[PDB]
Design a protein around this ligand. Structure first.
Ligand code: 0BC
Length: 112
């Protein structure tokens, strides 16, 4: 049993850490809009989109029952981007930077 407001207090600093990465978090701060970005096949490749604003909303409204559901969503966001984008691309390398930041920040929090 984890109180959702206790989850938010424990977990939101790990999310604020990702938002602080500028410009690395900018591709991730809102859901990918495939028409606006001119990438119409995005939803064919990415079946379960995820982004920072969606995770933040789930945190703020108590949608996470347990800390691994949050980690699963953050990892999903990263895996989607690594899947869709080429290894040589700007978004892929920004994703790798965010994942580096996240792994450093989430590791002690999960120990709590
Ligand atoms: C052209 C390919 O773009 C992508 C491809 C793939 C993916 C993923 C997450 O797989 C992400 C993107 N890129 C974006 O989603 C994106 C969006 C906005 C945005 C949206 S609304 C006001 N701005 C700004 C920026 C941005 N990057 N640097 N500065 N701004 C980047």
């Amino acid at each position: 049993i984890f109180k959702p407001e206790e989850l938010r207090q424990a977990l939101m600093p790990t999310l604020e850490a990702l938002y602080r990465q500028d410009p690395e978090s900018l591709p991730f701060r809102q859901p990918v809009d495939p028409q606006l970005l001119g990438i119409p096949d995005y939803f064919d490749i990415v079946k379960n989109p995820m982004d920072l604003s969606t995770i933040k909303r789930k945190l703020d409204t108590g949608q996470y029952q347990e800390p691994w559901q949050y980690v699963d969503d953050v990892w999903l966001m990263f895996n989607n981007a690594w899947l869709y984008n080429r290894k040589t691309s700007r978004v892929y390398k920004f994703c790798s930077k965010l994942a580096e930041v996240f792994e450093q920040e989430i590791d002690p929090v999960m120990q709590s």
